[PDB]
């Protein structure tokens, strides 16, 4: 009964496993630009563009488990200057484990200097709009800045009635509460699978200061790399 | 569905042993907005109801509440028009079945009994809802003469001599009982005037030949007839004098 | 709604609800004896104006060889005992040999479990004790559960349970070295123990003795002076 529930709680809870091989990541090394990539498309765009020049040494991975997705939560740092950090999180973090993930990443001793740039993709249906969802552009994107970000967003902000939940919202709430500059980019795309249109829509972000100097241009190298991950796991027979 | 609530599920009894869906069906009958009366005289049975026509584009002729099930049996309807028409059609089917099987005309008592059985079916099975309408049957019986029977969605079919149904049902019933206690001859003109004046005084409005519709069945002519506006106007003049 | 849905821990529901309903449904008792398996019940309320046209209340006769007592819902108990009689007569029509007790209780528990398995019906929440001599084995007593499986409880009590007293009275005589008189004495003692309100008073409890005399199962119900002396034995027990 209670013991079984306790065993499940451990199974669901996030466990931080170091990649270099109970101290939190930011507690171990401070960061200056921690980039969060949520979802397959976000991490794909990160790998294509940002993780093109530099060592990007693996520092940690927040392995976890949930009924939906067990993928990976590997964290990276440039290793040319460890000041800048990164995170490619593809595994879905459940609601009961998002705050555990936040504790593992930051804990209780933040630096209050990181420009937390969050990369995530949502579905068009989530976008609360006056008109029908079919009229919206397929890959359009939105941004959610915090109080002390002060850096102009490259895209229009979200409308009032629209909201965001789950892990990106968790990190943004943590940043807002502790006064950490940040911005949450929403790439509202009709296709949630790996499609290069979604990353093409993610492109405008590398132009702005957020994640600006990390990419060493080279569109040809990135564009060729984008075609690499276009090949993915075989889909089912549900849709044709 | 699994509607646990007593107020939104017919089958489940209320904690005080009441069927809230039946009460809400009665409230629907009230929501119909109209009122109807029926009086059993010593020579005939009457049914008087108001015909309020929204606007003028609607054809006044089409909108009606006086229906005939069997050529001798009349009816007046109160409640939602769709439910009223459905119950009228079911009563017509029952009358046809009775005529085909038994071979003679369906008595009013038995017709109301059958309709009450159907209402019991509706109010017992959770699948469907009680029909939001009250039907009053009138007709001439070879043994009891004029007969007035009111069937209701609950499944209550007791016969009446003078009865009413609608939004003003309570006041109409009070006035009708007051008239009944006098116990006069109850002639054709007398009973028709009683019904029409009951409706007029409960609604506190003056009646016009086109504002109301009247149907009557009499011993002399067992066939049910809906009085034309000319006869209603003549009766209104009779009340005036 | 979810009348046939497994619980997360495997505790099928509505059958614990049947269990509780049985628990707060009186106190039916039955003890097996070598001379003849015994049964007992709790005649709730005086019921002065009630007429005992039926054989007895909560003690329904199953043909000539078996009798049963119930401690659950009265309507469900009535329906299930009617089905019991129907099945027993069915087997009698099939073969001259009357239905063995085990087979009939198995059939009834199969009906109960089928209700517990196929949706569309609330489980039959009645717990039954069957007495009766059988050509196979001998005198037998079975404890039925409204959720299914029966038992071979030689001594049992449903409703207010309190099986400690019945065990202390049954194992007292080696559980097999008893007599009928000892069976009535122990049954009265345990009923008095369970009957916290005052004590068993004649018409407050109804018992039936099922013994085979001269090769014939006599199902005799004790009442009036028969129960009057039983509580007199309770007075004897008090001393």
């Amino acid at each position: 009964d209670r013991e079984v529930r306790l065993q499940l709680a451990r199974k669901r809870e996030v466990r931080l496993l170091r990649r270099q091989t109970e101290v939190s990541l930011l507690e171990k090394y401070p960061c200056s630009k921690f980039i969060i990539a949520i979802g397959n498309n976000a991490v794909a765009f990160l790998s294509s563009f940002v993780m093109n020049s530099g060592v990007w040494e693996e520092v940690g991975c927040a392995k976890l488990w949930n009924e939906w997705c067990r993928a990976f939560c590997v964290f990276y740092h440039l290793k040319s200057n460890p000041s800048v950090f990164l995170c490619q999180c593809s595994c879905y973090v459940a609601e009961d484990q998002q705050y555990q993930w936040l504790e593992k990443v930051f804990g209780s001793c933040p630096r209050k200097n990181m420009q937390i740039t969050i990369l995530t993709c949502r579905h068009v249906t989530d976008y609360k709009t006056s008109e029908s969802t079919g009229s919206l552009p397929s890959p359009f994107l939105r941004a959610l800045k915090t109080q002390n970000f002060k850096d102009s967003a490259c895209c229009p902000l979200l409308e009032q009635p629209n909201i965001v939940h789950d892990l990106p919202a968790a990190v943004l709430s943590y940043c807002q509460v502790w006064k950490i500059p940040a911005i949450l980019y929403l790439c509202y795309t009709d296709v949630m699978k790996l499609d290069l249109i979604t990353v093409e829509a993610f492109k405008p972000i590398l132009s702005t200061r957020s994640l600006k100097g990390l990419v060493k241009n080279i569109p040809q190298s990135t564009e060729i790399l984008k075609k690499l991950m276009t090949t993915n796991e075989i889909q089912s027979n549900i849709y044709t | 569905g699994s509607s646990a609530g007593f107020d939104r599920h017919i089958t489940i009894f209320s904690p005080e042993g009441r069927l809230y869906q039946v009460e809400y069906a009665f409230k629907a009958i009230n929501q119909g907005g109209l009122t109807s009366v029926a009086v059993r005289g010593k020579d005939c049975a009457v049914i008087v109801t108001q015909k309020k026509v929204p606007d003028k584009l609607l054809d006044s002729s089409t909108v009606t509440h006086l229906f005939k099930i069997t050529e001798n049996i009349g009816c007046v309807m109160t409640g939602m028009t769709a439910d009223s028409r459905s119950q009228v059609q079911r009563a017509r089917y029952e009358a046809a079945n009775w005529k085909y099987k038994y071979g003679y005309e369906i008595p009013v008592d038995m017709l109301c009994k059958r309709i009450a059985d159907i209402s019991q079916v509706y109010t017992q099975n959770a699948e469907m809802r009680p029909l939001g309408c009250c039907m009053i049957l009138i007709g001439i019986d070879e043994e009891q003469g004029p007969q007035v029977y009111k069937c209701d969605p609950a499944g209550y079919y007791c016969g009446f001599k003078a009865t009413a149904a609608g939004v003003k049902q309570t006041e109409s019933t009070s006035f009708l009982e007051k008239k009944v206690k006098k116990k006069f001859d109850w002639t054709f003109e007398q009973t028709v005037e009683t019904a029409i004046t009951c409706l007029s005084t409960v609604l506190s409005i003056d009646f016009k030949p086109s504002e109301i519709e009247v149907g009557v069945v009499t011993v002399e002519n067992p066939k049910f007839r809906i009085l034309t506006e000319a006869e209603i106007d003549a009766h209104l003049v009779a009340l005036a004098e | 709604s979810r009348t046939t849905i497994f619980s997360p821990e495997g505790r099928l529901y509505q059958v614990e609800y049947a269990m509780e309903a049985i628990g707060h449904a009186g106190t039916c008792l039955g003890i097996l004896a070598n001379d003849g398996v015994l049964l007992a019940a709790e005649r709730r309320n005086i019921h002065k104006l009630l007429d005992e046209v039926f054989f007895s209340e909560k003690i329904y006769k199953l043909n000539e060889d078996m009798a049963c007592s119930v401690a659950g819902i009265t309507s469900d108990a009535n329906v299930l005992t009617n089905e019991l009689r129907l099945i027993a007569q069915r087997y009698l029509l099939q073969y001259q040999e009357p239905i063995p007790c085990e087979q009939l209780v198995t059939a009834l528990c199969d009906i109960k479990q089928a209700y517990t398995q196929f949706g569309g019906k609330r489980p039959f929440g009645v717990s039954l004790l069957y007495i009766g001599w059988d050509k196979h084995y001998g005198f037998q007593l079975y404890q039925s559960d409204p959720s299914g499986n029966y038992g071979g409880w030689k001594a049992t009590c449903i409703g207010n349970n309190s099986a400690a007293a019945v065990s202390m009275l049954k194992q007292d005589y080696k559980e097999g070295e008893m007599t009928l008189k000892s069976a009535l004495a122990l049954a009265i003692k345990v009923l008095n123990k369970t009957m916290d309100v005052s004590k068993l008073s004649a018409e407050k409890v109804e018992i039936a003795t099922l013994t085979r005399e001269n090769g014939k199962t006599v199902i005799r119900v004790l009442k009036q002076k028969e129960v009057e002396q039983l509580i007199k034995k309770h007075e004897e027990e008090e001393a």
């Binding site: 709009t129 079919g134 629209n162 919202a169 943004l172 709430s173 | - | -």
Partner: protein
Amino acid sequence: MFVPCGESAPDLAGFTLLMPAVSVGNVGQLAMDLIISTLNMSKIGYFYTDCLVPMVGNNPYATTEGNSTELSINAEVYSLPSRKLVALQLRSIFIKYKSKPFCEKLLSWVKSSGCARVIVLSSSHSYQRNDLQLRSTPFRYLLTPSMQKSVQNKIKSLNWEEMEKSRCIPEFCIRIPGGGITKTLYDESCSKEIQMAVLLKFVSEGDNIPDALGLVEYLNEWLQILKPSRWKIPSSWRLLFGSGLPPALF
């Protein structure tokens, strides 16, 4: 877990909190947001707890363009120091087995800060009592013994209907199935003897805007919030039931 918006950590000494509850639909939260918008209660802090699923969005009460571009976390608190009025605002669904920690944390917060009276707007199920809800008014109240006797006599003069005291396992313990959080929160407050009152309403799932209006009118009648067109609805009360008509459907 109160985190000030700035750095002054404004003290809530001698204040009255206005918390909503996760009731049938969103009656309590809707009413709380409605009164917040009407009274123009400025944000003062951020109650960051680990009990609600995180969510973010722009300022629900946009008003000015500058105020429109803000951030609204799952748990934020606004206050109006003019009337010594503070008000928490719940806008999130709860995580499993986390509501009671919220109760304890907020009870400690109110006890330490000095917020005297906590008003808990909520709503219970429509059927509620044994047909008594259909016969009597939906509105009720449930005030802890620690509530100031002045407020108690004010309520008595208002001639309201007290909680039905629904029968529960021992025998008549107040049960509020619709609110859920309301029962445990009330018990925690009673243990802490913190002045608070639960203002609920027997309603059912669906559109609950009229229920919110009724509840805010109840609160106005008690504490004269506005004036015992009327309430300025938030800009958040938009696109709350649909996302446009698909042209092909019709």
